[PDB]
Enzyme design. Structure first.
Site, PDB file in Angstrom:
ATOM      1  CD  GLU C  42     -82.416   6.871 -16.819  1.00 44.05           C
ATOM      2  OE1 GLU C  42     -82.296   5.632 -16.935  1.00 44.05           O
ATOM      3  OE2 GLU C  42     -81.997   7.513 -15.831  1.00 44.05           O
ATOM      4  NE  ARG C  46     -77.357  10.610 -13.527  1.00 43.32           N
ATOM      5  CZ  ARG C  46     -76.877   9.394 -13.756  1.00 43.32           C
ATOM      6  NH1 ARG C  46     -75.609   9.238 -14.122  1.00 43.32           N
ATOM      7  NH2 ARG C  46     -77.667   8.337 -13.621  1.00 43.32           N
ATOM      8  CE  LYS C 129     -82.157   2.636 -12.291  1.00 42.90           C
ATOM      9  NZ  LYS C 129     -81.903   4.076 -12.034  1.00 42.90           N
TER      10      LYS C 129
END
Lengths: 209, 209, 209
Positions: C42, C46, C129
């Site tokens: 992943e 950001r 998640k």
């Protein structure tokens, strides 16, 4: 009438949260709980037999049977067709809440944070489960929420114990608590279930004399 | 302009969260807070008099009065008509946020989890209360959230204390904190309120020199 | 096919959560992780370079690269155009989830409470998640949620450690965990990264033989 669920919450201090893994236990469990004064019963729709267990428990005089784990409008329709008097969900969606209001269903949706309460207020609901209570900050978190939402009343559920239930019930914003401890896992022992229900039935509540 | 609420958050280290149970205390409380440098005031709409208390506090020179516990678009309209300069909510709904943007209202909505932040970002908002901070994981939970949402800035509120406020204020993603400790429950003692506000006004902030 | 993300979750016990601050580290990091058997990666969006880092890591044979911190439909489109095989978000909005389903994107959205799960179930998603796991009650909170949502499976992320990861992985409702510990902050040490990945790759899972 949105007042319906508020009346149901005040009927008994504790609302058993039933997970019926063996349908043959449905009638003895409902009979033992009603005999202890915990006649407001949440039968979760987590098991294949659960709708048939609801129909069995409805045959017990004095049992007020609702469906739990109602995740969507279709499950609410299936529960309402089975004769459930009220409906419980772990959380709230706009689709579920609008359907319950349109269907005149007495829904008691779970909330965990202020956004969930505000969605329910927007739908015309002001009575909620605080779920899962002991994993989202417990009584201190519920106190902060009840301080903000003065017109809302709550039913904490999730990790409640015979020890902590009276402490939650001291708060005037709490009408009842939900719990699974009254029916221990394993083959039902109706004498023990009735004894635990009689004890919970005697719990004092600031909100209900 | 979504920058309005960001400017308001940087004006003072601490934003008092006022619950005015006696309207006669509204003016002395606002005067004592402004005299201490905590002039950004959240008057929660949890009490019957609250809109009248907002109008009273607006009469204090230097008071920047906002409404708190703004639960829906109608309460925002009532607060905006009373002259509130900003608006605070415990949580965020799409209906409240779209109305605040359409009305050009400087809204500071509460968030508790990533889904709340993402809804606010979708509405064009990137400044939020982290509420109720001490019941939803506190500073460690806020740090994980600020690490994910790099462009967002926060105002933790809920259980903040004079001891913990500087610790929150060390984080550059935190612009201010909310608290009720500056106005103790009971009849106001304006000298004590001003002294607590002067101390909070001196709190250091990584985000604001 | 909503089964796609379930298959991805079972490929490796641990899904590294990568924050690539220096794009020159992208290839060595992906190579070291794949060499350790943690090839499901992943890459969080950001950082300014993150889409270019995704394109670099896709060049590593055996790397299954996804985008993380996918906050809206536009970021999903940018990640899908960069060739991401799956998509991760800290939370879920209806707009993001409907877009991922319409685009046939294998989305793995974060959830923190029952309302988030119910929104995902309404969109046709049942794999999430549990984020940020250690700040929202941890394994005890995830156990209560998995008990309610019997058909849902989870990937806890947020504060997971090599010590706690096997404890989460003992639960049959947990398919994998997310973590950043496999890539320590600072300049990459590929030998240490590969050694940590080989250890995590060997973690036992109740859900995956």
């Amino acid at each position: 009438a949105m007042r319906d669920i508020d009346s149901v919450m005040r009927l008994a201090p504790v609302m058993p949260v039933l997970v019926i893994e063996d349908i043959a236990d449905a009638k003895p469990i409902a009979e033992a709980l009603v005999a202890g004064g915990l006649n407001v019963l949440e039968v979760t729709l987590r098991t294949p037999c659960a709708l048939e267990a609801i129909k069995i428990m409805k045959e017990v005089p004095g049992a007020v049977v609702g469906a739990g784990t109602v995740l969507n409008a279709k499950m609410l329709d299936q529960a309402q067709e089975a004769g459930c008097e009220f409906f419980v969900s772990p959380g709230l969606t706009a689709d579920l809440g609008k359907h319950a209001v349109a269907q005149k269903a007495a829904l008691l949706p779970g909330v965990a944070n202020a956004a969930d309460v505000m969605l329910g207020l927007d739908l015309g609901l002001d009575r909620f489960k605080f779920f899962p209570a002991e994993n989202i900050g417990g009584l201190p978190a519920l106190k902060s929420m009840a301080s903000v939402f003065r017109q809302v009343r709550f039913c904490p559920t999730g990790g409640i114990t015979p020890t902590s239930a009276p402490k939650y019930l001291e708060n005037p914003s709490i009408l009842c608590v939900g719990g699974s401890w009254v029916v221990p896992a394993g083959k039902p022992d109706v004498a023990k279930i009735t004894a635990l229900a009689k004890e919970a039935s005697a719990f004092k509540r600031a909100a209900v004399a």
